[PDB]
Amino acid sequence: DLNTLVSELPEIYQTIFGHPEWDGDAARDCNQRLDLITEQYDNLSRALGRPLNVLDLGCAQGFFSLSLASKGATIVGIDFQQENINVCRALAEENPDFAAEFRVGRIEEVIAALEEGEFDLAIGLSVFHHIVHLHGIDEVKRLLSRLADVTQAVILELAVKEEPFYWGVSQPDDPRELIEQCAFYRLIGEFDTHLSPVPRPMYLVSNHRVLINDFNQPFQHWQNRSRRYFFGEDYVCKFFYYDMPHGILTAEESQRNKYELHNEIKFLTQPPAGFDAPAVLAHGENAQSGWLVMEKLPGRLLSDMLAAGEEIDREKILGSLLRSLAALEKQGFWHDDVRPWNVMVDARQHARLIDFGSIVTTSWPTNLVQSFFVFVNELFNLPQPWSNWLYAVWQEPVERWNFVLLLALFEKKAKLPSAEQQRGATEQWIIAQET
C-alpha cells in the first residue's frame, strides 16, 4: 500500500507524484525545478526529433522521473535508499503506460557503467554534494565529466558552500569547479531549498552540444579562459562569461567582456556596406554570460601560423587586411585591436579580422595607425620596400594619418624613396621600442 511506503520514507523529500495529500509534507514542492526541466527536455527532444532516454541520479521519490515519463520519456531512476525506490515502483505501477524503471544503486557505480548513447539527458539534482562530502572534489569532477561524455545534456542542481550547514565546509569554493572541465555549461536558474535562504544554482551542461534556447546543435570541437569557442559543421559559437568563478574576472573585466560582445552583436547584425562580415545565426546575453553564433570562416588564425612557423605571404596578408581596414574607415569604422590572434588567413593567403568586439565608431586615428606599425613588425626587422612604406607615413603631417592613406602608400611602396638613404631614421627605433 502506498500510505505505508510513504510513511516509511526517512524523508518525504519531494512531492509524491499524483498524490497531493502529501504536498504539505514534502520538503520541496518541485514545481519550479520541474517547469525548467520540462522546457529543457522539450528543447532537446525537439532537436533530436524524438522522445528522450532520461537518467535521474538520486531520484528520491521519483517525481521528476514520473513527470518526464508522463510526457513520453523513457526514464531510469537511481537511488541508494530502498525506501525511496519502493515508493518509485509503487507510483510507476499506478501509471503502467509510463516507461519508467527504478534501481537501488550508487551513483558512482552507475556512472562507471554507463554507455554513451544509452541516455540522452541525465539529471543530478542536489545529490553530488553528498559524493563530494565522501569522495572529494577530483573524483566528483571525473564522475561529472564521464556523465557529460556519455549523454547529450546534463542538468545539475548543486549545493554551495554558502549554505549554513557543517557539510558546506567540504564544498568547492564555487560550484562551477565541479563542471568547468566540461565543454559547455550555462546557468539556467536558481532554486530555494527550504533549508536556508541560500539558493542552489541549476546548470545545463554538455560535452557534445551547444544548448542555447534558440540554437541546439552538436559541435565537433571546442577551445578557449572566460571565452569559449564551439565549432560545428558550419558555425562557430562564441561564448562569453561575464560571471566567472573565483578571482578570475575583475568588475572591469566582466564589463569589458559584456561590452565587447554586445558590440560584436551590434556590428554584425548591421554591418557596414563595403565590408564582408560573417553572418549571425543566433545571439543572446544574460546576467552571467552572452553568446554569438556565426557562420564559420575557413583558414587558420595568424598567431598559430606564426607560432607553428608555417609559411606566410605577408604581401597578401597585409594588403587584404589593409583593404578591409580602409573600407571600414570609409564607413566610419575602426578596429581597436588588430593583432595576429584576431586575424584569420584563408588558403589563398587572404586575411580577415575575426574579433569585432573591438570595433569603434568614434588625433583620430593616429594611435591605431601607430600600433598597426607594430603589428607589421611582429608579422616580421623590415626589409625594403616595407621600411620605405613606413618612412613615407612618418613624413606625413599627423592629421593625415589614417587607413586610406596607409593602404594607398602600401600599394605604391615599390615606388617610394629608399628609407635607408635618408637621416632617416628615428621611426625605426620608435616602433621597435614599443613591440
Ligand X SMILES: O=c1cc(N2CCOCC2)oc2c(-c3ccccc3)cccc12
Q: How many angstroms from the chain centroid is the CA of residue 325?
A: 29
Residue with cell 601560423: 305
Distance CA 265, CA 281 (A): 11
279 binds a second copy, rule: CB under 8 A: no
Residue whose CB is less far from ligand X, 258 or 296: 296
Enumerate residues 185-224 that contact a second copy by CB under 8 A: 187, 190, 194-199, 207-208, 220-222
Distance CA 281, CA 270 (A): 13
DSSP state of 386: H
Which of 230, 234, 180 has the alpha carbon at shortest distance from 203? 180
The reply, when asked if residue 244 is annotated as ligand binding, is no
For the bound state, the minimum distance from the C-beta of residue 273 to a second copy, rounded and expressed in Å, comes to 30
249 C-beta neighbours (distance < 10 Å), count? 17
Site of interaction with ligand SAM (CB under 6 A)? 13-14, 58, 60, 78-81, 84, 106-107, 125-127, 130-131
435 binds a second copy, rule: CB under 8 A: no
Residue whose CB is less far from ligand X, 28 or 352: 352
225 binds a second copy, rule: CB under 8 A: no
Distance CA 132, CA 336 (A): 45
Residue 158 site contact among ligand SAM, a second copy, Cl ion, none (CB < 5 to 8 Å, cut-off depends on kind): Cl ion
Residue whose CB is less far from ligand SAM, 12 or 345: 12
**Residue 168 burial class via C-beta count within 10 angstroms: exposed 0-12, middle 13-18, buried 19 and up:** middle
Residue from 87, 121, 159, 179 in contact with Cl ion (CB under 5 A): 159
DSSP state of 28: B
Cell, residue 378:
611582429
Residue type, 104: V
89 binds a second copy, rule: CB under 8 A: yes
Enumerate residues 154-183 that contact a second copy by CB under 8 A: 160, 162, 164-166, 169, 174, 181, 183
301 binds ligand X, rule: CB under 6 A: yes
Kindly give the pairing relationship between strand 351-353 and strand 343-345: antiparallel
158 binds Cl ion, rule: CB under 5 A: yes
Distance CA 84, CA 343 (A): 57
Site string for Cl ion, 88-127 (x = CB under 5 A): --------------------------------------x-
The answer to whether the beta carbons of residues 287 and 242 sit under 8 Å apart is yes
- State residue 151 phi and psi, 5-degree precision: -120, 180
Residue 159 site contact among Cl ion, ligand SAM, a second copy, none (CB < 5 to 8 Å, cut-off depends on kind): Cl ion
- Give the annotated binding-site residues for S-adenosyl-L-methionine: 13-14, 33, 58, 79-84, 105-108, 125
- Give the annotated binding-site residues: 13-14, 33, 58, 79-84, 105-108, 125, 227-229, 238, 260, 295-297, 344, 355
